[PDB]
Design a protein around this motif. Structure first.
Motif, PDB file in Angstrom:
ATOM      1  N   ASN A   1     -10.021  -0.168   2.860  1.00  0.00           N
ATOM      2  CA  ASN A   1      -9.672  -0.329   1.422  1.00  0.00           C
ATOM      3  C   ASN A   1      -8.349  -1.086   1.279  1.00  0.00           C
ATOM      4  O   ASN A   1      -7.380  -0.558   0.769  1.00  0.00           O
ATOM      5  CB  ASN A   1      -9.543   1.048   0.770  1.00  0.00           C
ATOM      6  N   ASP A   2      -8.315  -2.324   1.705  1.00  0.00           N
ATOM      7  CA  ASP A   2      -7.067  -3.142   1.578  1.00  0.00           C
ATOM      8  C   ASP A   2      -7.332  -4.378   0.709  1.00  0.00           C
ATOM      9  O   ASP A   2      -6.492  -5.239   0.581  1.00  0.00           O
ATOM     10  CB  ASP A   2      -6.589  -3.574   2.966  1.00  0.00           C
ATOM     11  N   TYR A   3      -8.480  -4.423   0.087  1.00  0.00           N
ATOM     12  CA  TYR A   3      -8.865  -5.545  -0.836  1.00  0.00           C
ATOM     13  C   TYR A   3     -10.309  -5.288  -1.311  1.00  0.00           C
ATOM     14  O   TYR A   3     -11.158  -4.908  -0.529  1.00  0.00           O
ATOM     15  CB  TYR A   3      -8.808  -6.932  -0.156  1.00  0.00           C
ATOM     16  N   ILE A   4     -10.597  -5.494  -2.575  1.00  0.00           N
ATOM     17  CA  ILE A   4     -11.966  -5.274  -3.094  1.00  0.00           C
ATOM     18  C   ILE A   4     -12.332  -6.496  -3.935  1.00  0.00           C
ATOM     19  O   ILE A   4     -11.560  -6.919  -4.774  1.00  0.00           O
ATOM     20  CB  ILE A   4     -12.009  -3.963  -3.933  1.00  0.00           C
ATOM     21  N   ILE A   5     -13.481  -7.095  -3.744  1.00  0.00           N
ATOM     22  CA  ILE A   5     -13.781  -8.263  -4.599  1.00  0.00           C
ATOM     23  C   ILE A   5     -13.968  -7.712  -6.004  1.00  0.00           C
ATOM     24  O   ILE A   5     -14.714  -6.776  -6.183  1.00  0.00           O
ATOM     25  CB  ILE A   5     -15.058  -8.972  -4.175  1.00  0.00           C
ATOM     26  N   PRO A   6     -13.271  -8.246  -6.961  1.00  0.00           N
ATOM     27  CA  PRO A   6     -13.327  -7.755  -8.346  1.00  0.00           C
ATOM     28  C   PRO A   6     -14.629  -8.132  -9.062  1.00  0.00           C
ATOM     29  O   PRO A   6     -14.706  -9.148  -9.727  1.00  0.00           O
ATOM     30  CB  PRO A   6     -12.158  -8.381  -9.053  1.00  0.00           C
ATOM     31  N   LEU A   7     -15.629  -7.294  -8.974  1.00  0.00           N
ATOM     32  CA  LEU A   7     -16.909  -7.547  -9.684  1.00  0.00           C
ATOM     33  C   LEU A   7     -17.146  -6.349 -10.611  1.00  0.00           C
ATOM     34  O   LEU A   7     -17.113  -5.234 -10.150  1.00  0.00           O
ATOM     35  CB  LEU A   7     -18.050  -7.639  -8.679  1.00  0.00           C
ATOM     36  N   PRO A   8     -17.337  -6.579 -11.887  1.00  0.00           N
ATOM     37  CA  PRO A   8     -17.539  -5.500 -12.885  1.00  0.00           C
ATOM     38  C   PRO A   8     -18.987  -5.007 -12.864  1.00  0.00           C
ATOM     39  O   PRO A   8     -19.794  -5.410 -13.679  1.00  0.00           O
ATOM     40  CB  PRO A   8     -17.194  -6.124 -14.233  1.00  0.00           C
ATOM     41  N   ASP A   9     -19.301  -4.130 -11.934  1.00  0.00           N
ATOM     42  CA  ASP A   9     -20.681  -3.569 -11.812  1.00  0.00           C
ATOM     43  C   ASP A   9     -21.652  -4.665 -11.336  1.00  0.00           C
ATOM     44  O   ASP A   9     -21.522  -5.808 -11.723  1.00  0.00           O
ATOM     45  CB  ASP A   9     -21.146  -3.006 -13.163  1.00  0.00           C
ATOM     46  N   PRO A  10     -22.603  -4.299 -10.502  1.00  0.00           N
ATOM     47  CA  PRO A  10     -23.616  -5.230  -9.946  1.00  0.00           C
ATOM     48  C   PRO A  10     -24.754  -5.418 -10.954  1.00  0.00           C
ATOM     49  O   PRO A  10     -25.814  -4.839 -10.821  1.00  0.00           O
ATOM     50  CB  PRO A  10     -24.133  -4.566  -8.672  1.00  0.00           C
TER      51      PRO A  10
ATOM     52  N   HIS B   1      -6.322  -3.035  -3.432  1.00  0.00           N
ATOM     53  CA  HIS B   1      -5.723  -4.360  -3.635  1.00  0.00           C
ATOM     54  C   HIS B   1      -6.901  -5.249  -3.958  1.00  0.00           C
ATOM     55  O   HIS B   1      -8.011  -4.868  -3.719  1.00  0.00           O
ATOM     56  CB  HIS B   1      -4.993  -4.814  -2.361  1.00  0.00           C
ATOM     57  N   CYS B   2      -6.698  -6.394  -4.516  1.00  0.00           N
ATOM     58  CA  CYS B   2      -7.871  -7.279  -4.822  1.00  0.00           C
ATOM     59  C   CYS B   2      -7.463  -8.696  -4.463  1.00  0.00           C
ATOM     60  O   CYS B   2      -6.332  -9.065  -4.632  1.00  0.00           O
ATOM     61  CB  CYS B   2      -8.272  -7.185  -6.295  1.00  0.00           C
ATOM     62  N   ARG B   3      -8.353  -9.473  -3.919  1.00  0.00           N
ATOM     63  CA  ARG B   3      -7.966 -10.849  -3.494  1.00  0.00           C
ATOM     64  C   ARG B   3      -8.560 -11.918  -4.426  1.00  0.00           C
ATOM     65  O   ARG B   3      -9.754 -12.136  -4.470  1.00  0.00           O
ATOM     66  CB  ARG B   3      -8.448 -11.055  -2.062  1.00  0.00           C
TER      67      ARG B   3
ATOM     68  N   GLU C   1       0.876  -1.202   0.000  1.00  0.00           N
ATOM     69  CA  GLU C   1       0.000   0.000   0.000  1.00  0.00           C
ATOM     70  C   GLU C   1       0.905   1.243   0.000  1.00  0.00           C
ATOM     71  O   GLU C   1       0.546   2.288  -0.509  1.00  0.00           O
ATOM     72  CB  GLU C   1      -0.885   0.019   1.273  1.00  0.00           C
TER      73      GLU C   1
ATOM     74  N   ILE D   1      -6.332   3.406  -2.903  1.00  0.00           N
ATOM     75  CA  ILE D   1      -5.610   2.170  -3.336  1.00  0.00           C
ATOM     76  C   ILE D   1      -6.617   1.020  -3.334  1.00  0.00           C
ATOM     77  O   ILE D   1      -7.550   1.017  -2.555  1.00  0.00           O
ATOM     78  CB  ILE D   1      -4.436   1.901  -2.379  1.00  0.00           C
TER      79      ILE D   1
ATOM     80  N   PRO E   1     -13.867  -4.834 -17.453  1.00  0.00           N
ATOM     81  CA  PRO E   1     -13.698  -4.158 -16.128  1.00  0.00           C
ATOM     82  C   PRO E   1     -13.461  -5.194 -15.027  1.00  0.00           C
ATOM     83  O   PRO E   1     -13.658  -6.378 -15.214  1.00  0.00           O
ATOM     84  CB  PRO E   1     -14.997  -3.387 -15.888  1.00  0.00           C
ATOM     85  N   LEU E   2     -13.020  -4.741 -13.885  1.00  0.00           N
ATOM     86  CA  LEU E   2     -12.733  -5.664 -12.745  1.00  0.00           C
ATOM     87  C   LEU E   2     -13.650  -5.345 -11.592  1.00  0.00           C
ATOM     88  O   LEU E   2     -14.385  -6.171 -11.099  1.00  0.00           O
ATOM     89  CB  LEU E   2     -11.308  -5.417 -12.247  1.00  0.00           C
ATOM     90  N   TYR E   3     -13.572  -4.137 -11.164  1.00  0.00           N
ATOM     91  CA  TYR E   3     -14.389  -3.664 -10.031  1.00  0.00           C
ATOM     92  C   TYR E   3     -15.403  -2.697 -10.635  1.00  0.00           C
ATOM     93  O   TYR E   3     -15.634  -2.711 -11.829  1.00  0.00           O
ATOM     94  CB  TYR E   3     -13.445  -2.981  -9.007  1.00  0.00           C
ATOM     95  N   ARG E   4     -16.027  -1.889  -9.857  1.00  0.00           N
ATOM     96  CA  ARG E   4     -17.039  -0.954 -10.420  1.00  0.00           C
ATOM     97  C   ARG E   4     -16.386   0.265 -11.121  1.00  0.00           C
ATOM     98  O   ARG E   4     -17.018   1.297 -11.233  1.00  0.00           O
ATOM     99  CB  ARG E   4     -17.951  -0.434  -9.294  1.00  0.00           C
TER     100      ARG E   4
ATOM    101  N   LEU F   1     -11.900 -15.853  -9.755  1.00  0.00           N
ATOM    102  CA  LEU F   1     -11.451 -14.452  -9.904  1.00  0.00           C
ATOM    103  C   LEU F   1     -12.337 -13.592  -9.020  1.00  0.00           C
ATOM    104  O   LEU F   1     -11.873 -12.712  -8.324  1.00  0.00           O
ATOM    105  CB  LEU F   1     -11.481 -14.029 -11.384  1.00  0.00           C
TER     106      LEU F   1
END
Lengths: 105, 12
Positions: free
Chosen positions: B2-11, A57-59, A22, A55, A88-91, A69
């Motif tokens: 904010n030390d990890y975010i589940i990678p989901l491309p929009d709900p 990070h992603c698990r 981080e 920041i 895309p990965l996240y929102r 994934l």
């Protein structure tokens, strides 16, 4: 020779404190940068990517014969990033921020 | 947090 759907370089760091990552992404002043890394166990990896002034990070986890994934099971971490270079990965973030800054390209 | 975010491309 020695190409592959793995091997290669510059996108997965295998050794550093889970919290120091981080500080390496906080030291870099800019919005958008994706990287990957290894946890302290060979049963999960993690995508270290920051955006703007935050920041993220992603698990990612690994099953007995596949990988989770997040919402789908992929065949490997390289094919994961292959179709993920376009999706895309996240929102909001993606692998759209490689080496990025005013002095990159 | 904010030390990890589940990678989901929009709900969706």
């Amino acid at each position: 020779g020695s190409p592959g759907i793995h091997e290669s370089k510059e996108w997965y760091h295998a050794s550093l404190t889970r919290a120091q990552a981080e500080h390496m992404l906080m030291r870099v002043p800019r919005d958008g940068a994706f990287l990957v890394r290894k946890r302290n166990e060979p049963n999960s990896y993690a995508i270290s990517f920051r955006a703007e002034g935050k920041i993220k990070h992603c698990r990612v986890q690994q099953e007995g014969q596949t990988v989770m994934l997040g919402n789908s099971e992929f065949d490997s971490l390289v094919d994961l990033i292959s179709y993920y270079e376009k999706h895309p990965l996240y929102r909001k973030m993606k692998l759209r921020y490689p080496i990025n800054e005013e002095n990159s390209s | 947090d904010n030390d990890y975010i589940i990678p989901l491309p929009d709900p969706k």
